[PDB]
Amino acid sequence: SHFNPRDYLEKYYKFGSRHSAESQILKHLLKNLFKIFCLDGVKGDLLIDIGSGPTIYQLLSACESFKEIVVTDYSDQNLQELEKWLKKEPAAFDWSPVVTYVCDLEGNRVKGPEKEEKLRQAVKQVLKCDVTQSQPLGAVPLPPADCVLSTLCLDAACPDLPTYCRALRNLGSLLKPGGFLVIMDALKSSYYMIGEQKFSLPLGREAVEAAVKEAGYTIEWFEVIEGLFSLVARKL
């Protein structure tokens, strides 16, 4: 989107207007990310974030419940933009607007610099992921994880329903039996849609649930938040 990864961040994540469609949607996603990691007791040692692109907003609550976080992406350019911020380089994107937004949502217990630092301490590995592969992280060896988080990635990463099912199973390979799978994505309606989609309103919920059951997980919680949804599942 926009011209490149950075431009994309500049266009959508500066939080310049609380009423913009983008700020609205971040507010909804972060609200939910907060319930999942901070209210619903999703907790553990190691979390893998799959398809984290150049953004860190999806990890801000998560870094309170997880000793360590591994961020991954299909695109090496997203990863560089990310590292730029992680390593505190001079022309890193300013995350303060979203950071302090989350701080506020968490009850203004910490200010921005403490939340940023907490995230940096938790993130040590930055890795290529490909959801399509048997080994999502190829040759990288990782201890089994307590959580796999994938926000707005695996619906767009998988053209096929079969691939989507395969992907879930491939993601499963990273997880301790009993560990968490946290999916956020859209179920887009048929309106103004060009071409074809792998899921349907209220019915499509039941088909993504079926895909994840079939992939070797149980459904813990599914929440409607375009049809924006959460799905917490546990590996079998």
Binding site: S1, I25, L26, G53
Partner: peptide, 9 residues
């Protein structure tokens, strides 16, 4: 794309 990230957006 927003809320899809590059290069999916």
């Amino acid at each position: 794309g927003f809320p899809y990230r590059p290069x999916f957006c």
